[PDB]
């Protein structure tokens, strides 16, 4: 109970299950994270954008593969 | 091994083993200390 919300020390000191619930729901609110600067904010958003586009392309590739393999195209 | 055996090899693997190991890792991580 001292290292899940790495981005928030206030949550990491919560002795209740609320820490786990709030750790999920505040993970992407980068502006509210501990030890936060603007440069790190924009860089993390940039990397998250890259990962997101990768996820989209992987989803499309999966649709294509499953139509090619198990479909009747 | 034919291609039609891949569903029976993978669906149990993913849908049961991956939850087990993922739960183990996530529980261990969220129950850590400092």
């Amino acid at each position: 109970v001292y290292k899940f919300p790495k981005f928030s020390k206030a949550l990491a000191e919560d002795p209740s299950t609320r820490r786990i619930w709030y750790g999920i729901a505040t993970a992407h609110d980068f502006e509210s994270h501990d030890a936060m600067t603007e440069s790190k904010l924009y860089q993390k958003i940039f990397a998250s954008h890259f990962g997101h586009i990768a996820i989209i392309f992987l989803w499309t590739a999966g649709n294509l593969f499953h139509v090619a393999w198990q479909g009747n195209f | 091994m034919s291609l039609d055996l891949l569903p029976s090899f993978f669906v149990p693997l993913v849908g049961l083993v991956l939850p087990l190991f993922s739960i183990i890792g996530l529980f261990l991580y969220i129950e850590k200390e400092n």
């Binding site: 990397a47 890259f50 990962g51 992987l58 090619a68 393999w69 | -």
Partner: peptide
């Protein structure tokens, strides 16, 4: 109908994309 070689190498390439994903995941820190 695609062959075993076609599916196998796609699985291998998918593994490589997985190792690249954890490297990005670990680089975005714990």
């Amino acid at each position: 109908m695609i062959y075993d070689s076609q599916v196998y190498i796609a699985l291998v390439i998918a593994v490589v994309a997985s190792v690249l994903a954890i490297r990005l995941g670990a680089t975005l820190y714990n």
